[PDB]
Each structure stands twice: as C-alpha cells, then as structure tokens.
Design an enzyme around this catalytic site. Structure first.
Site, PDB file in Angstrom:
ATOM      1  N   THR B  16       4.965  74.596  15.960  1.00 39.69           N
ATOM      2  CA  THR B  16       5.249  75.503  14.866  1.00 39.69           C
ATOM      3  C   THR B  16       6.407  74.894  14.054  1.00 39.69           C
ATOM      4  O   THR B  16       7.213  74.149  14.594  1.00 39.69           O
ATOM      5  CB  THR B  16       5.525  76.950  15.414  1.00 39.69           C
ATOM      6  OG1 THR B  16       5.596  77.893  14.332  1.00 39.69           O
ATOM      7  CG2 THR B  16       6.791  77.006  16.303  1.00 39.69           C
ATOM      8  N   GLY B  19       5.633  71.734   9.384  1.00 40.76           N
ATOM      9  CA  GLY B  19       5.268  71.573   7.971  1.00 40.76           C
ATOM     10  C   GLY B  19       3.788  71.678   7.602  1.00 40.76           C
ATOM     11  O   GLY B  19       3.381  71.136   6.571  1.00 40.76           O
ATOM     12  N   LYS B  42      -6.726  80.897   5.653  1.00 44.13           N
ATOM     13  CA  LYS B  42      -5.810  81.201   6.743  1.00 44.13           C
ATOM     14  C   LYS B  42      -6.319  82.450   7.474  1.00 44.13           C
ATOM     15  O   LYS B  42      -5.977  83.569   7.110  1.00 44.13           O
ATOM     16  CB  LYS B  42      -4.401  81.414   6.182  1.00 44.13           C
ATOM     17  CG  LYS B  42      -3.345  81.833   7.198  1.00 44.13           C
ATOM     18  CD  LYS B  42      -2.404  80.695   7.551  1.00 44.13           C
ATOM     19  CE  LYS B  42      -1.455  81.123   8.703  1.00 44.13           C
ATOM     20  NZ  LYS B  42      -0.618  79.989   9.217  1.00 44.13           N
ATOM     21  N   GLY B 174       4.989  65.752   8.350  1.00 41.72           N
ATOM     22  CA  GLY B 174       5.297  66.872   7.479  1.00 41.72           C
ATOM     23  C   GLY B 174       6.599  66.758   6.710  1.00 41.72           C
ATOM     24  O   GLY B 174       6.774  67.416   5.683  1.00 41.72           O
TER      25      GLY B 174
HETATM   26  C1  LIG Z   1       5.560  83.391  13.242  1.00 39.63           C
HETATM   27  C2  LIG Z   1       5.094  82.257  12.336  1.00 39.63           C
HETATM   28  N1  LIG Z   1       4.461  82.768  11.098  1.00 39.63           N
HETATM   29  C3  LIG Z   1       4.174  81.316  13.140  1.00 39.63           C
HETATM   30  O1  LIG Z   1       4.077  80.146  12.789  1.00 39.63           O
HETATM   31  C4  LIG Z   1       3.424  81.794  14.396  1.00 39.63           C
HETATM   32  C5  LIG Z   1       3.278  80.629  15.398  1.00 39.63           C
HETATM   33  C6  LIG Z   1       3.020  81.135  16.840  1.00 39.63           C
HETATM   34  C7  LIG Z   1       3.150  80.029  17.910  1.00 39.63           C
HETATM   35  C8  LIG Z   1       2.610  80.563  19.262  1.00 39.63           C
HETATM   36  C9  LIG Z   1       2.948  79.703  20.491  1.00 39.63           C
HETATM   37  O2  LIG Z   1       2.287  78.651  20.641  1.00 39.63           O
HETATM   38  O3  LIG Z   1       3.863  80.124  21.247  1.00 39.63           O
END
Ligand SMILES: C[C@H](N)C(=O)CCCCCC(=O)O
Ligand SMILES: C[C@H](N)C(=O)CCCCCC(=O)O
EC number: 6.3.3.3
Lengths: 224, 231
Positions: B16, B19, B42, B174
C-alpha cells in the site's frame, strides 16, 4: 530442530523476535543457537547477532559474512566487490549447529526471497535443504495482510512448513487497524506472540520477562 | 491490427502507498496522448470517510472521464474489515467481472486498480485481484518502490502472479528520487534484471498540474510499449 525466522519485509522487528524467542526458549531450559549467515549494514551500527546475545544471553552465535552497506546482501556484495557465501557453506553451518535438545534459529536478511548465497539462493532454499519450518515476523500495520499472505504462499509453494506468525511490534494504544489486523492475522495463521512496542530498548532483565510472557511455554517447549 | 475488444491491465502494487494510483493516472495520460481511449476502474475503494478517492485522483491528474467504481467503504482499512465495520458486504466476484466487462469497446485500454496489494481480499471468499485478472484475461502491471525491501516484495508478488498464470506486463517504480542514492540505484538495476521496468515516475509527480503531469507521463513510458498495448 531448526526454525528459520523470516519477516514479511525489512524493519518488522525480526531480530528482536529472534531474541525474544531465544530468551523464552532459554527460560524453558532449552539450549539455543542463533545462526545469521549474512548480515548487512554494519557501518551504520548493525550486528544482529550481538543484539541477540545482549538481549537474550545467547552464546552460540554463528555467521559467515558482514557487509557495511545498508542493502540487500547481493547488492551489498556487488558493491563491496566480494561474493556471497555458497549454498553448501550455509546449510552445513546450520546442520553442524543442530544438537539434541537444541533450538537452532536461522535469521534471514530479512525477507524470505532475499538472495543469501551464490547463485540466487534464498532463505527459502536453505529452509528446504535443512527441513526447517519458518516463523514469519509481521507488522500490525495496514498492508500486513497482503505481505503475510504473499510470504505464506511463497512458503507453501516450496513446501516449507509455517510454524506461525509473530507481530514484531504491538502498538499502544493499538488503533482500529492494528486491532482489526490482529484478528485477521489470527484467521490466516497461529500468532505465537505480539511483542509490545518498544521491546527493543529493554535491558536484559526486562527483556527476559517480556519474552517469557510473550510466548506460550508449551508451544516453545514443544519445539524441541 | 484491428482488435475487436479492449486490452485490460490490472494495476497492482507490492504494498500500500507505493504509488499505484499515480501510476494509473500516468499510464492513462500517456495512452490517451497516443490516441488510445482509456477507462479506469476501481471496483473496491476504502477510506472514503477520510477522503480517499482513487478514481477522482485519476480524473484530476490525467483528465480521464471514464471512471468506473462499484463499492466504497468509509474506514481506511482492508476491504473485508472496512465492509464489516460499515455493516456492508464485499462485492461478489461476478459484480467485479461485470463492472470490468461492461467497459468493453474495441481498441480501449482499461486499467483495473486494486485495493492495496495483490492478495488483498476484494470479494468473498478470498477472491483477490489475481483471481479477477484470471477471469478477465488481464495482464498485471506491478507498482514497486526503489526502497530497501522492494526486491523481496516484488519477487513475492511476481511469484504469486505466475502461480495462477497471470501474465506480467512489467514493473513501474512509483516514485524515483533526485538524485538516486546508492540503494535506489542498485535496486533499480536489480529490478531491471527481474523484469521490464516500464517507467519510474519522478518523486513528487502526484503534485504536478494537468500540464506538467501530461508531459511527465508522456516522457515516462516507452511509446512503443504504450502504443503496443492495444495492438
Ligand atoms: C486505506 C487505503 N485507501 C488503502 O490503500 C487500503 C489498503 C488495504 C491493505 C490491506 C492489507 O494488505 O493489509
Ligand atoms: C540494511 C538492512 N540490514 C537490511 O534489512 C537489508 C535487507 C535486504 C532487503 C533487500 C530488498 O528486498 O530490497
């Protein structure tokens, strides 16, 4: 009786987890050796084995190469101009440590698929050679579930047993995500421990007590 | 060279915050400037209560109009926990595939952006962006950092794609620093040994205006590669 200790990534608290497991195992009357074949980032002050001796009182601390640059071993070796150890070198070292009534921990540098030895040999390949299970160190932060799941897939793809997860640092207070992730990670695997945030700064005595409390005695004893 | 259907790329990341969204915008912008019609999709968006809106970011950065969403959850968590927190369900596999499929047009490039990394659960039970890419026969473009930890994360992600025979479209860094340090430079060279590195977006790219962002995006990808994605 070998466990590799690997992380979902760099800076998840892995060395400190190795120390905490070592301490817990020492307190259950188990003999511990920690092997960290390749260590990088020494000139900025990194010696993970020494951290483990200090925090856990481990005396059998084995290693083969230390690189000054804070990079992956391969990158660090390419920059130093000095090759990495060999696959057989690593495996044999770990096999020689192996003793009855002994818990031998092998700490990777740091993530599972980092090249450790010539040519392109990873900690996973080493786990396979020595029939070791893998303890996976994780964070409680956003992003941990994808990283944990990726690592656990990589383990199962080459049939290396998962021995469980440890959360390297458990925040205070937790927060909604950390709180949620802890339940979610417990649905994917056994969480053997979650180490209180800041455990890395504890003196030897406080560290030992934190460790004895952090793991399940029966589980630890069971390893040997 | 007439292709009768769209090319689909899922755009995933090694984690997460690497980028992904700005990469989507950049490729969308580059492809538009090559005269390809681009849709960006999305299916699962979390963090909307905190303002998180990846589709809106893309429209803002790239001027993309064809923006397809489905599920939005207020809390900035993994989809499963954000849904549960809101008393909502995760979408079904089928609703994701349908959202993507209804965008079909000949010669279109559709970019499907995940939530977080590849193995994030998007649909119950345990349906991930990798499963979706298999369903729609998409290749995967993987967004990475040049930071320490990237090689292990990239190789983990690539392995997971291969496990389900999802084709790798290449890597995109990114955020690329000026100047690059020893670490960043060696990572980029190591990344190029693992995979084709399609682009490495200038750090700060997210803050450019339409004009600068479009110019950045056009310089950032090989135009032979971009041109070749819709046949
Ligand atoms: C909160 C934000 N909009 C986002 O990118 C959510 C990503 C969630 C990652 C979940 C994980 O692998 O722990
Ligand atoms: C510098 C520090 N001692 C360290 O964890 C190196 C780990 C190697 C990570 C290399 C990568 O995956 O990019």
């Amino acid at each position: 009786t070998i466990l590799v200790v690997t992380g979902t990534g760099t800076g998840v608290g892995k060395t400190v987890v190795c120390a905490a497991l070592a301490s817990a195992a020492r307190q259950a009357g188990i003999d511990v050796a920690v092997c960290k074949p390749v260590q990088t980032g020494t000139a900025r002050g990194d010696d993970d084995l020494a951290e483990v001796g200090r925090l856990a009182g481990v005396t059998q601390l084995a290693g083969l190469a230390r690189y000054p640059q804070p990079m992956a071993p391969a990158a660090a070796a390419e920059h130093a101009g000095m090759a990495l150890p060999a696959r057989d070198q690593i495996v044999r070292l770990i096999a020689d440590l192996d003793r009855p009534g002994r818990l031998t921990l092998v700490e990777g540098a740091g993530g599972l698929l980092v090249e450790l030895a010539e040519p392109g040999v990873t900690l996973r390949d080493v786990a396979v050679d020595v029939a070791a299970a893998a303890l996976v160190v994780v964070t409680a932060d956003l992003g941990t579930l994808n990283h944990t799941k990726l690592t656990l897939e990589a383990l199962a793809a080459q049939q290396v047993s998962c021995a469980g997860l440890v959360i390297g640092s458990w925040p205070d207070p937790p927060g909604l995500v950390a709180a949620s992730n802890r339940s979610a990670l417990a649905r994917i695997a056994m969480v053997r421990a979650a180490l209180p945030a800041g455990a890395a700064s504890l003196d030897a005595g406080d560290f030992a007590a934190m460790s004895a409390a952090a793991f399940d005695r029966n589980w630890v004893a069971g390893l040997v």
